[PDB]
From TrEMBL:
It comes from Sorangium cellulosum (Polyangium cellulosum). It comes from the Bacteria. Coiled coil: none annotated. Involved in production of the polyketide antibiotic thailandamide. The chain holds residues 3099 to 3490 of 6011 of the full protein. The gene is dszA. It is found in: Cytoplasm. This is DisA protein.
Amino acid sequence: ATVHPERFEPLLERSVPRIQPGLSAVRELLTHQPAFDALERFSEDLLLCIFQDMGAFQRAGSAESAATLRERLGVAGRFGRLYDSLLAILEGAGYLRIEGDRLFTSERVTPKKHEVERRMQQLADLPAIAPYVRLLWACYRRYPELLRGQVAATDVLFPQGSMDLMGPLYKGNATADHFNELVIKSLLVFLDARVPHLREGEKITILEVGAGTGGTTASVLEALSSHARHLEYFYTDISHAFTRYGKRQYGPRYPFVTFQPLDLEGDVVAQGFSAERFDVVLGANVVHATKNLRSTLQSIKRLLKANGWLVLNEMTRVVHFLTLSAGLLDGWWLFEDAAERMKWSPLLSSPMWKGLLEEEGFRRVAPLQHSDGTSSWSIQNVILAESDGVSR
């Protein structure tokens, strides 16, 4: 075990209240819950429609073998577990009764084709959910191909290589922007606390993991750019291509950024990153894409200074929207530690992230609060955690 020296005092406890959104912001986010509830129900209905388009579950009172059907529909081997999850979504919606391998269509099963297309248009008229509706509809149109593995998921989710569908998901809609802003706020609160105590020429070093094509990184770098003189920011991704394209896009305007590949599942020092180099590690919707979460967290602890922060932006409920979309991608199914995750997912709820990060030796672990009486936002959260400086 490696124990880093403590080079500055713990600062997370007194920072959490400066980041925690107030009631008015929380209420404003919660105005979007009826739309996201309707998105969930729509996903159920859309899913029934996808099976019907493939010649399954067209009528109430019919029985199938799950195992036989999978084979008959042509589901790709790498989608076995997605397929089981899709059956349970139908079961939870009241469309299937499931008894072991036996599937029975219920009375709620009717022809969904026309209904779902009308519902799609209605839900597309709600801005907070519109880009999610758009993405599900694009997947819907090609779903039988997707599920049979006859077309790559990235060709549908990134049409003609573009960000036309994914881009609007990650930013420019209310819920994504709320959380994007909470990450930025966290970083600026950190900087405000530390900058005053820096020695001459000393810098604060932030690592972003899984920066991808940098969609959310753009606004981070702009918010940070006034601290440029005491900041180094590492833009990293498993993909060397993605880091190169990020350098092209952002390097000229933000000379404080270093662009370097990083695979946290490998040996971080072998990859050119030293122990206790980083004041902050940021992971925006990517740290869950790993085979072993505990191990990935320990590598983060190796990279972080003692009392350095991990800042996560994570989806914290296995919503049907994600299962249907993100569930088609390898990163969703990479996990080899199912008992640490929510079922049929790589995701953790806020309480699960809190307990796990504590077990791995973070302190002051703070999933931010988004509750107003009996209502609360559980679909997504920003989670802050302070490293104790111990790494296996």
